[PDB]
Design a protein around this ligand. Structure first.
Ligand SMILES: [Zn+2]
Lengths: 96, 115, 112, 100, 69, 55, 68
RNA sequence: AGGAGUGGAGCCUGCGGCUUAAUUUGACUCAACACGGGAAACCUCACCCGGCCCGGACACGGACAGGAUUGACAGAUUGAU
RNA sequence: AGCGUGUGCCUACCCUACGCCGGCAGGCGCGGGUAACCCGUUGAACCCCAUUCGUGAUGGGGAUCGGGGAUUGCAAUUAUUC
């Protein structure tokens, strides 16, 4: 499949900012629900998150519709590696 | 032998009248087929069929064309060509007659066999 | 929704039930669970990330809800956590029968 | 001026206790109050086939719920009404304030 | 005779096209020419009338017991 | 245009426009009072909502 | 695996040998000579040029066909 | 003791049988047969015929920004702009 | 008369009265309702009263069978409904 670059760096810059996110079980949808900025899709976000499932960087939760993902430290080091910023910044889940 | 009339009007007159009095010329069930709004949402196949009818053949029957639409209207401008109805297996190679105006295109299909 | 979500997720540390208290501008909620040390994680990271999950899921004003948890008293007298304990005993390597008599003597001298 | 306090809940005994506590507070804070009305309740009826398969005797579920609504009238400013609705909050009771 | 045009039996016929009330021998000729017209044009309703079953779209598991044996 | 041909039948009516909230089923759904759920899971999780069978 | 009807091939891209080298043709100097005419559309100007067939020209993502 | 009846007349509906590329399928005396809430014009839909795309993540290699790779109007093609 | 039902999550599809147009099915303006408020005192049906019919497959039965006219949707032929 084709993965456009802007949406994927968008989901890094949202996933590093807010660590946990939900996604309703919908492939046939024109617009991703809680990201109302651009015409971002949902199936590409699903495929990226199951890629981090296949590497094991993020855990999985699923109840009826809303796929819940939980990142581990491997996802943290992958995010801070592809972000190319020094690690003096922290994700907001660590912030109290 | 008799010059047939579409309930009073000849076929030369049928090709000499247009839609805006044609929908009073035919019945009410397929008036809404032509008058409820714009015909563009699935009518690209209808437009291509109109191109295939208006393209000019030599002095014989025109070239064969098949369609997968069954709920197609018949018009006086549709008279005198070849269409093929989608029956799943076989396109029925049956001509039309100028006295067929009013019915649908899918009026020529057997079900299975004469058991 | 939230009850079956906690049965899917919080079953690792013995979740029992939920009763959410509706109140405007402060939506408090209590969670009934046994192992309280395993619900907060590492100084309250887990509670805040479940709060962020609820905020991103249900479409609420941010920084409004707060999630509580506590140790259950007379823990043998809640049926969900005892079933989860029997599941945890039967999962690893135990025989079914001796686990049944163990949970039976636990509930009988628990006080029921 | 006129305050039309409408109260919605689910249980009858909790509604009666909350209405009694509101009447007691209105008597304690030295202000007039109108009569406690009891609005009639409607059912919640759903009939379903009890068999997930297509097999069984003709057995069904007859679910019913009585949902409770009630109303009362006040003649006071919003300070005392807000304090009463802010104190003694139980989760089965949803208050509603409307000046009408 | 001040009878409204909707208040007729046959409307827009092939012969005249005017709203006319046509009686027993005339309707016999009308039904004969209509059945021969559908038989000649070989429409779906014409073939259904040619086979001789319920042309109005019904189910024939319990009906038609007295037709053929 | 395959992805342009995903959406050729608009889902605003019929049965494909609607689905359950619990099990992705489209047979035997409850539309009354916005339940939006199949009947068997409604029976399973009725008491968790707060429903009691008084009759 | 192998069905009855012969399957066609998907439109894979071959090795276009030094395409950008054929974008401009330099005779002797440091000047720039444009062989293919640049696209006059609003989306792309002097950065994208039109596709060169033998019958009629075509654009890229603009998708305009200019009649002669 | 009775009453209302059914089975017979016409019609809706389900099953068995025939047939069709396909007529999707389970249940067979109480304890299957207006049953799966199953009143389907398309989705439903699970069946056949017709053509597209992957919804092959990832690991080991080949290949590769000197190209590893995508989206199509002029116009022939089925069924479609 | 009583159980009931009603502006919607993704989700648009609701309940209708008043006032005109045509016999009808329907069309345009027009307000109200999150509901003992608007439909709605649900002027419900069956029954009842004053004519019409008279033992005749008959003023029962409406099966079978053509034409015209309406609303729904992307579209009703294998009759969608009236
Ligand atoms: Zn251009």
């Amino acid at each position: 499949m084709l993965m456009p670059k802007k949406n994927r760096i968008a989901i890094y810059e949202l996933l590093f900012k807010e660590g946990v996110m939900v996604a309703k079980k919908d492939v046939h949808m024109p617009k991703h629900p809680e990201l109302a900025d651009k015409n971002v899709p949902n199936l590409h976000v699903m495929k990226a998150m199951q890629s981090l499932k296949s590497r094991g960087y993020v855990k999985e939760q699923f109840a009826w519709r809303h796929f819940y993902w939980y990142l581990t430290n491997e996802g943290i080091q992958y995010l801070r590696d592809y972000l190319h910023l020094p690690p003096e910044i922290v994700p907001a889940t660590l912030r109290r | 032998f008799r010059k047939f009339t579409y309930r009073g009007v000849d076929l030369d007159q049928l090709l000499d009248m247009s839609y805006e009095q044609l929908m009073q010329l035919y019945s009410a069930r397929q008036r809404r087929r032509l008058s409820r709004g714009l015909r563009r949402k699935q009518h690209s196949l209808l437009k291509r069929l109109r191109k295939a009818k208006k393209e000019a053949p030599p002095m014989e029957k025109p070239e064969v064309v098949k369609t997968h639409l069954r709920d197609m209207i018949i018009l006086p401008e549709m008279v005198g060509s070849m269409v093929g109805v989608y029956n799943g297996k076989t396109f029925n190679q049956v001509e039309i007659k100028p006295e067929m105006i009013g019915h649908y295109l899918g009026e020529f299909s057997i079900t299975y066999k004469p058991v | 929704e939230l009850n079956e979500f906690l049965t899917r997720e919080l079953a690792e540390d013995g979740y029992s039930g939920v009763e959410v208290r509706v109140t405007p501008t402060r939506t408090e909620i209590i969670i009934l669970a046994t192992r309280t040390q395993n619900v907060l994680g590492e100084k309250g990271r887990r509670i805040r990330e479940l709060t962020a999950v609820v905020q991103k899921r249900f479409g609420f004003p941010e920084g409004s809800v707060e999630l509580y948890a506590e140790k259950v008293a007379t823990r043998g007298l809640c049926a969900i956590a005892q079933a989860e304990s029997l599941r945890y005993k039967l999962l690893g390597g135990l025989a079914v029968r001796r686990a049944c008599y163990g949970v039976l003597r636990f509930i009988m001298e628990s006080g029921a | 001026h006129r305050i039309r306090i409408t109260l919605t809940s689910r249980n009858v005994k909790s509604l009666e206790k909350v209405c009694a506590d509101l009447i007691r507070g209105a008597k304690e804070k030295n202000l007039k109050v109108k009569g406690p009305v009891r609005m009639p309740t409607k059912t919640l009826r759903i009939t379903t086939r009890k068999t997930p398969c297509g097999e069984g005797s003709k057995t069904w579920d007859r679910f019913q719920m009585r949902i409770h609504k009630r109303l009362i009238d006040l003649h006071s400013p919003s300070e005392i009404v807000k304090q009463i609705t802010s104190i003694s909050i139980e989760p089965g009771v949803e208050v509603e304030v409307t000046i009408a | 005779y001040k009878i409204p045009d909707w208040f007729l039996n046959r409307q827009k016929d092939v012969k005249d096209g005017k709203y006319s009330q046509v009686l027993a021998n005339g309707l016999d000729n009308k039904l004969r020419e209509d059945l021969e017209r559908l038989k000649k044009i070989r429409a779906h309703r014409g073939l259904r009338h040619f086979w001789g079953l319920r042309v109005r779209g019904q189910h024939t598991k319990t009906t038609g017991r007295r037709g053929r044996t | 245009g395959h992805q342009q041909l995903y959406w050729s039948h608009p889902r605003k009516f019929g049965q494909g426009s609607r689905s359950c909230r619990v099990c992705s089923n489209r047979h035997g759904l409850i539309r009354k009072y916005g339940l939006n759920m199949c009947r068997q899971c409604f029976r399973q999780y009725a008491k968790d909502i707060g429903f009691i069978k008084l009759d | 695996k192998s069905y009855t009807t012969p399957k066609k091939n998907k439109h894979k891209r071959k090795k276009v040998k030094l395409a950008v080298l054929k974008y401009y043709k330099v005779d002797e100097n440091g000047k720039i000579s444009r062989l293919r005419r640049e696209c006059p559309s609003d989306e792309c100007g002097a950065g994208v040029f039109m596709a060169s067939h033998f019958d009629r020209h075509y654009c890229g993502k603009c998708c305009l066909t200019y009649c002669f």
